[PDB]
DNA sequence: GCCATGGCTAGTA
DNA sequence: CTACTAGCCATGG
């Protein structure tokens, strides 16, 4: 599997998340058959044009939260996009935007 | 090669 | 609950 391949598969996968459902770096990395690739699942998302028509927002972390970004908190997008999707999120005690994984969670 | 860097994760404590 | 740890692994200097 070339990376250019990984990347698309992932994309396809991530594109199979329904409105208002989410999934998780890890899972999608499993789903496409690369269980050790959660990081790289992220790298894929990070690597997308803002114009993209791909539900990049529907992919948080297995700890049930939205991942912090050393590409600065512009990810606040994620929260919002999710809020529009219809997703109850709350702040913790470092805001760590958080949602009920079991509730909102994709399961083919 | 080394090293440092990430939208990660599972296991401890 | 949080707060560290291994491990993980492509990527870019
Ligand atoms: C992985 C998605 C990042 C991205 O393209 C984006 C961030 C903020 C606003 N629009 C797009």
CA dihedral A73, A38, A40, A50 (to 10 degrees): -40
The total number of structural domains in chain A stands at 1
Solved with: X-ray
* CATH code of the domain containing A63: 1.10.10.10
- Looking up tokens 């990347």 gives A7
Name the β-bridge partners of A98: A65, A90
Chain C positions under 7 Å from a protein CB? 1-2, 7-11
Q: Which residue blocks in chain A are alpha helix, DSSP H?
A: 3-14, 25-31, 38-46, 76-85
Report which ligand 1 atom has the smallest distance to the Cα of A45.
1
A24 CB less than 7 Å from any atom of strand B: yes
How far is residue A80 CA from its own chain's centroid? 13
Q: Are strands A23-24 and A59-60 parallel, antiparallel or unpaired?
A: parallel
A45-53's contacts with Cβ under 8 Å and 24+ in sequence apart are A45/A14, A46/A71, A47/A7
A104 CB less than 7 Å from any atom of strand B: no
Resolution in A: 2.8
CA of A26 to the centre of ligand 1 (A): 20
A63 CB less than 7 Å from any atom of strand B: yes
Domain that holds residue A6: 1-108
């Amino acid at each position: 599997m070339r990376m250019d391949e990984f990347y698309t598969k992932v994309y396809d996968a991530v594109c199979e998340i329904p409105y208002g459902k989410v999934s998780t770096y890890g899972e999608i990395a499993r789903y496409v058959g690369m269980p050790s690739y959660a990081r790289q699942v992220g790298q894929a998302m990070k690597h997308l044009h803002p114009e993209t028509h791909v539900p990049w927002h529907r992919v948080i972390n297995s700890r049930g939260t939205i991942s912090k970004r050393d590409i600065s908190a512009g990810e606040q997008r994620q929260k919002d996009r999710l809020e529009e999707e219809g997703v109850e999120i709350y702040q913790t005690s470092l805001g760590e935007y958080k949602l009920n994984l079991p509730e909102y969670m994709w399961k083919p």
